[PDB]
Design a protein around this ligand. Structure first.
Ligand code: COH
Ligand code: COH
Ligand SMILES: *[C@@H]1O[C@H](CO)[C@@H](O[C@@H]2O[C@H](CO)[C@@H](O[C@@H]3O[C@H](CO)[C@@H](O)[C@H](O)[C@@H]3O)[C@H](O)[C@H]2NC(C)=O)[C@H](O)[C@H]1NC(C)=O
Ligand SMILES: *[C@@H]1O[C@H](CO)[C@@H](O[C@@H]2O[C@H](CO)[C@@H](O)[C@H](O)[C@H]2NC(C)=O)[C@H](O)[C@H]1NC(C)=O
Ligand SMILES: CCCCCCCCO[C@@H]1O[C@H](CO)[C@@H](O)[C@H](O)[C@H]1O
Ligand SMILES: CCCCCCCCO[C@@H]1O[C@H](CO)[C@@H](O)[C@H](O)[C@H]1O
Ligand SMILES: C[C@H](C(=O)O)c1ccc(-c2ccccc2)c(F)c1
Ligand SMILES: C[C@H](C(=O)O)c1ccc(-c2ccccc2)c(F)c1
Ligand SMILES: *[C@@H]1O[C@H](CO)[C@@H](O)[C@H](O)[C@H]1NC(C)=O
Ligand SMILES: *[C@@H]1O[C@H](CO)[C@@H](O)[C@H](O)[C@H]1NC(C)=O
Ligand SMILES: *[C@@H]1O[C@H](CO)[C@@H](O)[C@H](O)[C@H]1NC(C)=O
Ligand SMILES: *[C@@H]1O[C@H](CO)[C@@H](O)[C@H](O)[C@H]1NC(C)=O
Lengths: 551, 552
């Protein structure tokens, strides 16, 4: 079998077979040398001697609120800290991208083919004796057993950080512009060739789709007015293909950038809000530039909204889920004097860790109703009955479930959770501890160390037998959470590099793009830099309901 | 009309309409300010004074050989000098890219659509009064007149820098992997979606085409053996689409990565050489890695050949045409501590300046024969009859034509040269002086300053009237060349940023790629770092003939 099955190379060392039963570790620029890249250089010794654990770092950022309140009001200090954040995090990401599900070695096919999800770790070889390499049994435990014993939800466990349905649906809406698995090819393939924040879930992936959605007047998108309320156009009107069950009436088949947003009313809420925002920005640009044609108005509006999105994702979305008292800032200028690649490739592992199924509630409470999953799915008539204002008000005050901590995946979506396990195995993912070492984290020595308790830990120990073969995805959901937090250590320390790299790697953050002229002047520029989740709702939802990602 | 037609914004400032008859300049990080970004900041004002002209720098680089001889042998100095080159040159290129033929403002369409050539300067607005904006006559001079009066060859003018046919055919073969104009859409579009050195002219643009060219054994490419010599396979054998006249014999319809390389036996020479080189590297890798499969042997060989290409293009190709006494070096590490974007988008202007038609001779001299254009086109039997060895010996000895200086475009390719002017107007290029300012060059204040002579300058004066509306492409071919050189200032100062950007902007030059493991260990890595145009011919051509980009 393949000589590199045991994953012998440490500290980001590259493994290569040198014969049928021998290997060689490439230790170039790792700071280590030796057969297995384990002997540290002198400077490396000092660095590891001063490098604080992510847990101690998280402690500092989540305590001393008064001190942080002082720091946040010092523009120099605020910029200084945020600069370090935006540099150290994406450093853990290979850019240009390297491996994918078919290539455990670097190749031109892996690099050039945008249909692939890239891979932060190469897949386990096909001829390996055990599914994880050489450790563990001949087969992984039944995904159904892992599912039912430590993942499925008994009592609903609310998020202690206070995340609401606005957060949960925003996450689902935002991430599904770059998480679009090409299931015709397999789980390791994507339909989102933009590999980032291009807002294709609003404008469409292809140019044909975009043009069917556009009004070609004033740079706006097509829309319908129902009861004085602007909503997305229909499939019949645009001939834009959408995924709907055959029993869905023609009038309720809204056409949006993403082909699946019709299936969940929460997604359609944001789709309507963002469509309204695009046309709102067109109005603003038109009286700034009465000479501009339809095409430039549309294109400039898209760039502003892309900037709006990144602005909101960092200073509201990421600000909330991090729990830091420090005030995050979206400022591309911080990276102008640093080494940084303004490009991005979506990693399969980024996708897998973002399957936040425990976030979902048991019922969706709107106004005075409690819709089940069966009642909620495909049901856009719910959106029309209550309206966006009621949706925002209701979802702002409905709490979400805890992601980590185990046993909080709703039974309604158990098939999806089982698929995340099965497809991780299908794509030959490496073990949890391999991904922890990949991201500068200390491996777990026991299951009790992973869960932070005894009951679930014993369940897993009887399933996997070895902590070194524990799978990544079910680990993220049963991981011991940070104190009163929604996530555990692995989730944050893996997701943060992936996220920030995708956000800052956008070309509009490059210095040749980050100009007022890119966004039609200072006015359009200020739209991006003053954007927020509250303003997004206040501008586009009747009555300006209060909203946030907490309470 | 559009209030930015006159191009009022200077020093990389960005123009924007604010009304029907008002504009605004964005002077962000230009080093300048004021309405037109013309008032220099104090630091900028100092930099301008202390900055030596490109001609001054060219003099130093092409003189004091005794000093460069010392510099080239002091690894710290050589690297330091090379480190400056690799940092100063690509800095003039927008990366991530910006404009294209359809967008004179930044948009997500222009950034994301890889079917476009990108643009260093935005196109002239459609509603502008004159073709170049506001200056000049209502119409540009007749393209045919410009062609015949100052471009077409009267008598053959040899390149004083000594470039041979090996150089000219390498230029055409190499650059036609990223210059693949999609004429089904327009001249502003490309079929090379890789936008750089990916060797699709060897392996094919699509996976479907690649798999028809592959042997699927030992990682090798399919081939045929004719008279003991290894040649590319046929169209019939691989079902690979190639551009051939119907009357071409089946066995002579060679199938390679690029559809148009059957057009001329000079291109098929290099295609055959690179085909053999790939299968040679396969043999070496199969020896080092008996455990490896066909797919890994193929992919790793490709990365190595990409490395070889960038290595040769820098240290032999660019080294030759530069004329520098300084010894250029291909070392990705020089940028590891620098700010550099490992990405590239092929500019339409890079394409236009690379139309080095004057390089072509009146006849193609192989052995004792002198084939004409009509006899040479689509005639691979010449390649077979003489063999690669005689091809290399003959082409190493035959001189090439001077590109700059005017009147050296062969009549046989006059239609191509004319098309370069017509298409540049369709794509609405800005003037020569606009592209000179864009790349930190002083604008030509007269046609005589441009040509360095009087006869062509006078003709150009009667045709264009204004020097500020002189076109880019014909100016590159009539420009006063550097002393005994092949190019003029504008060709180098525009070409060097573009070239070096695409070369170092390759992913294999990135820290995560630049490792022995990437190329199958130390052995594959050594193939790259010792590659040369001589080694390429020596390993893959029978008899190992001496070869060079210079006749000497
Ligand atoms: C982050 C928040 C979030 C939420 C609120 C959410 C809410 C819901 C929801 C009803 C509200 C339903 C019916 C589903 C059901 C599904 N989810 Co999510 N999901 C979420 C995160 C994700 C992500 C991220 C993906 C990856 C998409 C992809 O293409 O793989 C995903 C994938 C899926 C899939 C595709 C299967 C797969 O590729 O594994 C289904 C089906 N699910 N989910
Ligand atoms: C760099 C050296 C070089 C040489 C030696 C050379 C020699 C020759 C040659 C020799 C027998 C022939 C028959 C042609 C003929 C052509 N040239 Co060139 N060309 C060269 C560089 C280019 C470039 C660069 C383009 C632009 C490609 C495009 O997409 O427009 C080009 C375009 C073309 C095209 C594309 C269609 C068109 O624009 O009309 C043809 C056909 N040609 N050329
Ligand atoms: C990159 O840009 C090019 C040029 O804009 C895009 O090609 C263009 O594609 C559109 C639609 O895909 C073509 O428009 C027309 O649509 C109508 C539909 O009613 C149809 O009847 C026409 O025959 C035509 O298809 C347009 O002609 C075409 N232009 C060119 C020059 O090919 C290309 O799609 C863009 N790339 C991506 C990935 O979107
Ligand atoms: C990226 O890779 C995919 C999968 O290897 C390629 O899709 C294959 O294309 C070939 C030839 O067109 C087909 O025979 C296969 O059936 C396809 N496989 C799948 C899973 O779809 C795709 O062509 C590659 N992308 C590019 C641009 O070449
Ligand atoms: C004597 C050593 C000179 C350095 C060798 C590389 C030549 C650098 O050339 C410089 O490049 C800059 C950007 O392209 C231009 O702005 C300068 O005008 C030019 O002098
Ligand atoms: C071989 C192709 C030559 C075509 C020339 C036709 C256009 C006439 O061009 C004239 O040719 C003369 C001699 O070259 C020059 O002295 C004139 O400056 C030029 O205008
Ligand atoms: C700001 C903070 C940080 O550590 O820098 C932080 C914390 C968490 C995330 C994060 C975002 C999405 C999924 C998982 C983690 C993130 F993207 C950034
Ligand atoms: C290395 C040297 C430089 O001045 O940096 C240099 C680099 C590139 C070119 C060059 C110019 C036009 C086409 C292809 C290459 C050139 F003519 C000179
Ligand atoms: C390297 O790793 C292999 C297997 O993981 C082990 O057998 C060997 O002893 C290690 N060598 C060193 C020097 O750590
Ligand atoms: C959809 O929601 C409406 C409430 O607006 C409800 O009356 C109806 O029964 C739902 N449909 C399904 C199939 O659950
Ligand atoms: C800017 O340029 C325009 C035309 O190019 C000119 O009329 C105007 O006087 C210039 N303004 C300044 C301050 O130089
Ligand atoms: C092709 O080249 C051969 C020499 O190998 C020559 O005899 C023949 O006439 C050429 N064909 C044409 C059509 O010119």
């Amino acid at each position: 079998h393949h000589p590199c099955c045991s994953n012998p190379c440490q500290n980001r060392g590259e493994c290569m077979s040198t014969g049928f039963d021998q290997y060689k570790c490439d230790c170039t620029r790792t700071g280590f040398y030796g057969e297995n890249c384990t002997t540290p250089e002198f400077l490396t010794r000092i660095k590891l001697l001063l490098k604080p654990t992510p847990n101690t770092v998280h402690y500092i950022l989540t305590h001393f609120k008064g001190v942080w309140n002082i720091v946040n009001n010092i523009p120099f200090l605020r910029s200084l800290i945020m600069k370090y954040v935006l540099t150290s995090r994406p450093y853990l990401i290979d850019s240009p991208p390297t491996y994918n599900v078919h290539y455990g070695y670097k190749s031109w096919e892996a690099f050039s083919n945008l249909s692939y999800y890239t891979r932060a770790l190469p897949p386990v070889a096909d001829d390996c004796p055990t599914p994880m390499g050489v450790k563990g049994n001949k087969e992984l435990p039944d995904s159904k057993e892992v599912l039912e014993k430590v993942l499925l939800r008994r009592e609903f466990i609310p998020d202690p950080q206070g995340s609401n349905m606005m957060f949960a649906f925003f996450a689902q809406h935002f991430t599904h512009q770059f998480f679009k698995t090409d299931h015709k090819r397999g789980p390791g393939f994507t339909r989102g060739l933009g590999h980032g924040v291009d807002l294709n879930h609003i404008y469409g992936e292809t140019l044909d789709r975009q043009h069917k959605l556009r009004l070609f007047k004033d740079g706006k998108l097509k829309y319908q007015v129902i009861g004085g309320e602007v909503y997305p156009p229909t499939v019949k009107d645009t001939q834009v293909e959408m995924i709907y069950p055959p029993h869905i009436p023609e009038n309720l088949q809204f056409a949006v950038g993403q082909e699946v947003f019709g299936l969940v009313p929460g997604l359609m809420m944001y789709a309507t809000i963002w469509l309204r925002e695009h046309n709102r920005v067109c109005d603003i640009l038109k009286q700034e530039h009465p000479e501009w044609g339809d095409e430039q108005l549309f294109q400039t509006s898209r760039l502003i909204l892309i900037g709006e999105t990144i602005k909101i994702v960092i200073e509201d979305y990421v600000q909330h889920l991090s729990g830091y008292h420090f005030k995050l800032k979206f400022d591309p200028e911080l990276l102008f004097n640093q080494q940084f690649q303004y490009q991005n490739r979506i990693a399969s592992e980024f996708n897998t860790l973002y399957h936040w199924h425990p976030l979902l509630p048991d019922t969706f409470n709107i106004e005075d109703q409690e819709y089940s999953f069966k009642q909620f799915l495909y049901n856009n008539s719910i959106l029309l009955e209550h309206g966006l204002t009621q949706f925002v008000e209701s979802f702002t005050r409905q709490i979400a479930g805890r992601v980590a901590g185990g046993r909080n995946v709703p039974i309604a979506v158990q098939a999806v959770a089982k698929a995340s396990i099965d497809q991780s195995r299908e794509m030959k993912y490496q073990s949890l501890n391999e991904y922890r070492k990949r991201f500068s984290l200390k491996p777990y020595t026991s299951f009790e160390e992973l869960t932070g308790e005894k009951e679930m830990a014993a369940e897993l120990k009887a399933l996997y037998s070895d902590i070194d073969v524990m799978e990544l995805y079910p680990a993220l959901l049963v991981e011991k959470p940070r104190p009163d937090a929604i996530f555990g250590e692995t989730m944050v320390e893996l997701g943060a590099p992936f996220s920030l790299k995708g956000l800052m790697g956008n070309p509009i953050c490059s210095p040749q793009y980050w100009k007022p002229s890119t966004f039609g002047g200072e006015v359009g520029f200020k739209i991006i830099n003053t954007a927020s989740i509250q303003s997004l709702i206040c501008n586009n939802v009747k009555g300006c309901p209060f909203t946030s990602f907490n309470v």
